[PDB]
Design a protein around this nucleic acid. Structure first.
Lengths: 60, 57
DNA sequence: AATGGATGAGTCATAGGAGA
DNA sequence: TTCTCCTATGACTCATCCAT
């Protein structure tokens, strides 16, 4: 009974620890990316604005 | 004692691993939003420039 | 060399979900 | 609906890695 279950549960403890390592590794790595994407839109926005003004002046 | 002190660590160690997971989940959430909104403003702007580039051309 | 904390891994108790 | 069994997961303990 035990010899069966103990090795059986050994696998579960292993598999669960497995997922938490990956859940975090993934969220961590994903937020790293989303951070960049955001960061770049902030600069894309800054530059778009400078162009917007510049053109309005050409229409001054 | 040796066991009792160590319990306290194992406990603390589990908690850290738990939190990081939480924090991340939170960060992912807000990022998706801010990140999504700035995209919209990015589009209101891309087109307006496209338009003005024409009016000036 | 000795002691103390961190973390992986094995074990147990126990809960929650799938199904008879 | 309630009863049964099984996996997933917290919490303990142990062995081991590093620094004091």
């Amino acid at each position: 009974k035990r010899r069966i279950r103990r090795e059986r549960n050994k696998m579960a403890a292993a598999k669960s620890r497995n997922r938490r390592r990956e859940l975090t590794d993934t969220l961590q790595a994903e937020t790293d990316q989303l951070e960049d994407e955001k960061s770049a839109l902030q600069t894309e926005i800054a530059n778009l604005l400078k162009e917007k003004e510049k053109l309005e002046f050409i229409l001054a | 004692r040796k066991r009792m002190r160590n319990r306290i660590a194992a406990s603390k160690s589990r908690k850290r691993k738990l939190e990081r997971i939480a924090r991340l989940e939170e960060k992912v959430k807000t990022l998706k939003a801010q990140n999504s909104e700035l995209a919209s403003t990015a589009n209101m702007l891309r087109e307006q420039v496209a338009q003005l580039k024409q009016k000036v051309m």
